[PDB]
Design a protein around this ligand. Structure first.
Ligand SMILES: NC(=O)c1ccc[n+]([C@@H]2O[C@H](COP(=O)([O-])OP(=O)(O)OC[C@H]3O[C@@H](n4cnc5c(N)ncnc54)[C@H](O)[C@@H]3O)[C@@H](O)[C@H]2O)c1
Ligand SMILES: NC(=O)c1ccc[n+]([C@@H]2O[C@H](COP(=O)([O-])OP(=O)(O)OC[C@H]3O[C@@H](n4cnc5c(N)ncnc54)[C@H](O)[C@@H]3O)[C@@H](O)[C@H]2O)c1
Ligand SMILES: NC(=O)c1ccc[n+]([C@@H]2O[C@H](COP(=O)([O-])OP(=O)(O)OC[C@H]3O[C@@H](n4cnc5c(N)ncnc54)[C@H](O)[C@@H]3O)[C@@H](O)[C@H]2O)c1
Ligand SMILES: NC(=O)c1ccc[n+]([C@@H]2O[C@H](COP(=O)([O-])OP(=O)(O)OC[C@H]3O[C@@H](n4cnc5c(N)ncnc54)[C@H](O)[C@@H]3O)[C@@H](O)[C@H]2O)c1
Lengths: 341, 341, 341, 341
């Protein structure tokens, strides 16, 4: 079967591996290697114990065989033997000897076409950048929207961002049915790994500020990314993100001008229908009075909160939740599974 | 020289009293009484020691006469003697004896014209409900917008909500310059006194949930209230509020459809000129990369973050911060000071 | 079976019901009624969605049959039909007709022997007060330490507190092995339901204070409680609790003077042996560097953290974790199960 | 007079410069230079805007005179002109040219005697290491305890840690009056800048875990530092630190065995008397029902909470609060002032 490697064993990388074991349906590929600059004992500890998603429900054993380090991981009636590497320079990875079909690049540091190619140079056949593109990519994929357009020549694929995987379906479903003149996105997002505990020097002066204390407005990569998947939306959408002191789960607030008559009732019926048919793999809709923690560990790319839909004149707002870690992780698995042979 | 009383000595009431002392402008009226169901010792302790605004910078003496109880408060070279009451039923209050010109109704429990009138029965001349009207009021006021529309005959007045006091200026300023077809508000708000520590039974199933752990979408009274202050915008505005785990300070995100040509530059230029002329009392504008904490203890009704301004087609989004406790409290005092002859 | 009822469907009562459903081994008694002052739609909503313990992994359907309200709950191959009451006065509850064998008193309001006897008046055969004794009880019980002391004639039983169910085993084990001259406890505890979101009037001026913003030292009922369970330890142990901004899980820091030679090694070995033999049902020991969230949803009364153990001379500190909600709730069900068996 | 420089403009460096402006006492020395790896704009931003201590009540102007960058700072009727540097390696700094009497080494990185001497190599006469010693120092000083013991020839001084400056007075006073056989310390501490936002690789597997979600036991440097100030206490004292989700302020809980008769009353009288005489510069005592936020921006090294004092037999516990940032910063300024003699 396909052989996947993970580069960067962080929030995303770890959750990717966890989600593999937890999936109700076994995936027709294996994760055979991981790479991080941190040492193996640190990685196994963080893999096993998570403040957000709880204890890994399984067993992990470190072995040294030849001069190589492996994890033997057993859970949910599955076992993976996974080689562990510690190489800060992607070009030096052994992807050639490990026969790596797909690298998931989850470090945040190799988003450029050139940087991503280092894995190719190392002998991997395909990279998925687990982030919005920086400059160029062969393809920008949202699973469940355009994963069928991947061609065998697409070697550098971006799986965009949590935010994009939620925004893109909403925009598409709604634009397809009612037509969107323009739209503006407000995201309300849990804290991220790159924020600060206390006020501290940082590249961004807002993300420098104490994350547990502040409401922090910041930029979002999701708009640039959406425009690469839907170029027709150029100059028709913008937005930003707001970090707030929760550990996980985010929401998108999308405000649009419709090109045809809208009611709350019709918007919701459209989204329900979308969720039951074409987008059932990735989208749910709820009518219950729920809050962020209710969607922690949810595998959906988005869960529309139909109770928040509002219309005034031609202007509407819709609202969807997502687990920004578990949704994304599951979509990386789904995406890999879609490559088939 | 008017005589103000405060009913409900909570986040708003205490802050009103503090703001009187801390104001660089000395007000003409005196605060001469306060009432709460809690005893004076609890009241003075919470007045002195505040988790949000810090230690009160002054001296509080409690005096027990045969009958009456008084605080003697000294700070910033000002002195008040303040009778303290403990009467749950506002009709039984001795406002007649005390010659109360204005009661500030800060309990959250007496917003109906009926309930507000309990203070008129107890002997007060005028009541300012410190919230959105529940049904009828002689006037709904946003200081710095329609405070002159108060008639010397008006007895039951509403100072609406913090949210309203920020929404209305924005909507007014933008409607007057560009025209607003429709607008939709997203408020991102610190937790409030009525929320829950842990998941607990509550009249509102969203506010029942742990306030420190969750992003919580909920209703805003601001929209109902804005209709009263500006009935020309009936059915043109809607919105909601999101609670997040910060202790204080909020932001409004207003997305509108303009009726004439707009750019980021033009919108900002207008908001700047407004803050420098007609609205300099209640409004500021910044371009510095700030976050919620930086507005704690700010007395402004709103501070526009101009770097957040966005335009797509006929649609735009503006963003303003406000201290939901300190701005409102200052606006109550400003309102009381407007009644002066 | 035996027939249990829960009085007060809060953090404890709701977790008791959940724990009934989640226990790997099925309990051989049924929960047949719950009572609370909140309406049934609020109860069912909070039972299904939990900020701390996640979604209930099952289905709940409300039915009206006669004039009676029922919950039909399905989870883990198990079914209960549970009558819902809403009676603020326990003497008025229909325990006679429901043939209640045990009431779990989980409101915090009926801890006195008199208050608790009201359930007996209503026709229940036995009450467990899910709190420290207020004045008198027939028995004060720590499951796993002295639950075999319950007499057939005992009708008002205290299951003490979470803190007590952790402290008592620790003291008993160390005292039996090395002897305790004296000991002092510091508990670090997540926020509880009776605290405040913002600074607010309260009967206790420390629990008045914003629970998300502060370290708040307060009293504990566990020292009084331990005295009832182990009278020899009168005048030998004291302590207190600190509330900190986490949502669940606590720790005991116990400092004791030993009456015989001690080392870190010998203390940890003892605690381990105890957890593997006599205390296996309620006690675990870990050697890994774990934090509070790693014990969320743990059913143990205590998990000793052997990395924390310190000795200087004759003085020693031990440290144990517990899920204050889930442990206690499991112990309630274990206690009920003990009467049957 | 005397010329100070700050190496590292973080929580400590920044608060030292703020504390300089805010001190009621005007200090007989000037801060004439700061160095950080971050650019001047970030530094000035973080000096002006603080999530913990609020906005600097003053003005800062950046000028470029020659090719040198300077901050013109004005606050509290006082002025400084501070050169800004951006050198990653201390030996390169221009201390000789600038005529630096004392460098405050606040990076956390140059705590070895060797790394510290790099500043003396750079032309500084004296370094204070603003942290516990790594290997050797000429003197480990707790201001208000042993600062008289600095020799004019001492060149590499440690001002220990925040925790050390609260613990040492407590230990000394109690040991002096009553004799301490042994003692154990539990510190309850706000989060610190080296902690994690989310679960992230870290040298310390505990400090790896999400800082806003968890109670986190970890090591304290204070025991090693205290044994350098009081070698007699070797083998007689140990302890640790628990990090909890607050932004600032900590407490020490000291459990000790007394060598002579003790009561609560006598321990409290002692600590009170100490605070009023020989420790009046650094120590206070309160019996008010206060919480962490009430000691934010307190300049004391420790504030004893006398209500927390417990005695059982020969064992006692005391409790003291401190602002871990603002206390230490003031003690740094106080130590520099002591060198004028
Ligand atoms: N977390 C989310 O909600 C979310 C959602 C969508 C996309 N993303 C993206 O995922 C990426 C990673 O974010 P995260 O939250 O997992 O962050 P993280 O900081 O938890 O992960 C970074 C990891 O990479 C490792 N690493 C750093 N440099 C390395 C190198 N040179 N070689 C190998 N390993 C290296 C680090 O040790 C760490 O384990 C970012 O690009 C982020 O935008 C995150
Ligand atoms: N907090 C904000 O940011 C904000 C801003 C604008 C308006 N408001 C409004 O201000 C009002 C009060 O809100 P708050 O945040 O001060 O709440 P709070 O809970 O802090 O204040 C309520 C106070 O009223 C007292 N009280 C209760 N019953 C009483 C009675 N029968 N008689 C007298 N006092 C009684 C309570 O003891 C308490 O001190 C509400 O209408 C709220 O919507 C709040
Ligand atoms: N939560 C813990 O960590 C913990 C652990 C051990 C013991 N306890 C004890 O258990 C008790 C309950 O605390 P909790 O955390 O579940 O609190 P909670 O506030 O979550 O639960 C109280 C519940 O009782 C209901 N109630 C109120 N009045 C009632 C009445 N007259 N009749 C029936 N129901 C009524 C409330 O509506 C609410 O559902 C307290 O005595 C507490 O000290 C709590
Ligand atoms: N904050 C506290 O509560 C406290 C109290 C006592 C002691 N300390 C100790 O003080 C030290 C620093 O702590 P902090 O909280 O101020 O940390 P911080 O991380 O907030 O500040 C460190 C600063 O040093 C700068 N820096 C890094 N490398 C540098 C270099 N080579 N040259 C110049 N600047 C450099 C960083 O950019 C940053 O501004 C640590 O040893 C800490 O343990 C902290």
């Amino acid at each position: 079967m396909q052989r996947i490697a993970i580069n960067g064993f962080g929030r995303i990388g770890r959750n990717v591996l966890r989600a593999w074991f937890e999936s109700p349906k076994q995936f027709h590929f294996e994760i055979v290697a991981i790479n991080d600059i941190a040492d193996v004992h640190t990685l196994v500890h963080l893999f096993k114990y998570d403040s957000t998603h709880g204890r890994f429900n399984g067993k992990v054993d470190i072995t040294i065989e030849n001069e190589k380090i492996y994890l033997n991981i057993q859970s949910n009636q599955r076992l993976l033997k996974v080689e562990v590497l510690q190489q800060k320079q992607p070009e030096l990875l052994p992807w050639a000897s490990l026969k790596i079909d797909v690298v998931l690049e989850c470090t945040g540091l190799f988003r450029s076409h050139a940087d991503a190619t280092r894995h190719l140079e190392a002998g991997a056949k395909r990279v998925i950048i687990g982030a919005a593109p920086f400059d160029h990519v062969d393809a920008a994929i949202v699973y469940g929207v355009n994963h069928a357009d991947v061609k065998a020549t697409d070697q550098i694929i971006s799986s965009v961002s949590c935010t994009t995987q939620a925004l893109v379906p909403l925009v598409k479903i709604i634009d397809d049915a009612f037509g969107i003149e323009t739209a503006l996105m407000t995201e309300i997002h849990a804290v991220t790994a790159d924020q600060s505990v206390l006020d501290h020097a940082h590249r961004d002066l807002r993300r420098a500020r104490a994350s547990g204390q502040n409401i922090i407005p910041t930029t979002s990569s999701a708009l640039g990314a959406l425009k690469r998947v839907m170029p027709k939306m150029e100059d028709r959408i913008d937005g930003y993100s707001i970090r707030v002191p929760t550990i996980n789960v985010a929401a998108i607030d999308l405000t649009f001008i419709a090109q045809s008559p809208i009611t709350v009732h019709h918007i919701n019926e459209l989204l329900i229908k979308a969720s039951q048919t074409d987008y059932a793999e990735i989208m749910a809709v709820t009518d219950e009075p729920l809050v962020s923690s209710d969607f922690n560990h949810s595998p959906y790319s988005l869960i529309v909160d139909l109770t928040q839909t509002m219309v005034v004149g031609h202007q509407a707002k819709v609202f969807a939740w997502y687990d920004n870690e578990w949704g994304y992780a599951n979509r990386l698995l789904d995406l890999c599974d879609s490559f088939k042979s």
